[PDB]
């Protein structure tokens, strides 16, 4: 149902439906979804105690082919909302890395209060969610990270406000993750808008299949309008 072709000139884009689906959602292709449920649950949880909204996560789970056999990594997970939604929708093991100690504390406490509610409503046990309080560069400096997962690895990199040096280091490091790994970024790790890119960086194209996307309107906190993001799949 997505429009476009995933190319730089025709990125994949999903227009909002004029009327909500049966779950009240204007975003998802499916006529049933959990976006509003998670909106309300997240808001209630964090009241009891720069972001991607639940509609974005619902679209992402489909785009990145996330399965219960995958391990989902949110690099810069913040309060952990993405981890909670991905675990609920996929059953994958979820790992978040957060450099801010306060944010890691908030994510762990929110997970503790939220997991009982998800398991009570769905009747199913939640997969594991782990929060690592650290700079992601320290963690990813280990070449053995992700290797045992055999490419059953999904990585979210919300790096619009990351310094360019950090994104560049991640672009270098992700060339060496196993085949099959899927990586989502916003400030492109492997700029490929121009046709000469494959001559400038032939290794990046040998190592990745690259797909361009527009995020749906009102799916990101900072913008009501749409914007670009990219999925790179290790060949
Ligand atoms: N070098 C670094 N290592 C780990 N986390 C970092 C980091 N630089 C920035 N971050 C974190 O990345 C987060 C970006 S906000 C994105 C939050 C979440 N991924 C979402 O999509 O909703 C911030 O919480 C910030 O603390
Ligand atoms: Ca490797
Ligand atoms: Cl490898
Ligand atoms: Zn939805």
Residue numbers in the entry: 45 to 93, 110 to 295
Give the exact sentences the study uses for this entry.
In higher eukaryotes, a single DOT1 histone H3 lysine 79 (H3K79) methyltransferase processively produces H3K79me2/me3 through histone H2B mono-ubiquitin interaction, while the kinetoplastid Trypanosoma brucei di-methyltransferase DOT1A and tri-methyltransferase DOT1B efficiently methylate the homologous H3K76 without H2B mono-ubiquitination. DOT1 enzymes are highly conserved across metazoans and fungi, but not in the early-branched eukaryotic class of kinetoplastids including Trypanosoma brucei subsp., Trypanosoma cruzi, and Leishmania spp. In kinetoplastids, three DOT1-like methyltransferases have been identified, two of which (T. brucei DOT1A and DOT1B) have demonstrated methyltransferase activity toward H3K76 (corresponding to H3K79 in human and yeast) in vivo and in vitro. Both DOT1A and DOT1B represent minimal enzymes with less than 300 residues, comprised of a significantly diverged N-terminal domain (magenta in Fig. 1a, b) and a conserved C-terminal methyltransferase core domain (dark blue) that contains canonical and non-canonical methyltransferase motifs. Based on structural and biochemical analyses of DOT1A, we identify key residues in the methyltransferase motifs VI and X for efficient ubiquitin-independent H3K76 methylation in kinetoplastids. Substitution of a basic to an acidic residue within motif VI (Gx6K) is essential to stabilize the DOT1A enzyme-substrate complex, while substitution of the motif X sequence VYGE by CAKS renders a rigid active-site loop flexible, implying a distinct mechanism of substrate recognition.
To investigate the implications of these differences on the structural level, we determined the X-ray crystal structure of DOT1A and compared it to human and yeast active-form DOT1-nucleosome complexes. Δ42-DOT1A crystallized in complex with the methyl donor product AdoHcy in two different crystal forms (space groups C2221 and P212121), and their structures were determined at 2.1 and 1.9 Å resolution, respectively. The asymmetric units of the C2221 and P212121 space groups contain one and two DOT1A enzymes referred to as Molecules I to III, respectively. All three molecules are highly similar with a root-mean-square deviation (rmsd) of ~0.3 Å comparing 234 pairs of Cα atoms. Hence, we will describe the structure of Molecule I in the C2221 space group and only discuss significant discrepancies among the three molecules. The DOT1A N-terminal domain folds into a Zn-coordinating β-hairpin structure comprising residues Glu46 to Cys79. The β-hairpin structure is tightly associated with the methyltransferase core domain through a hydrogen bond network by extending the antiparallel β-sheet of the methyltransferase core domain. Therefore, the N-terminal β-hairpin structure appears to stabilize the DOT1A methyltransferase core domain.
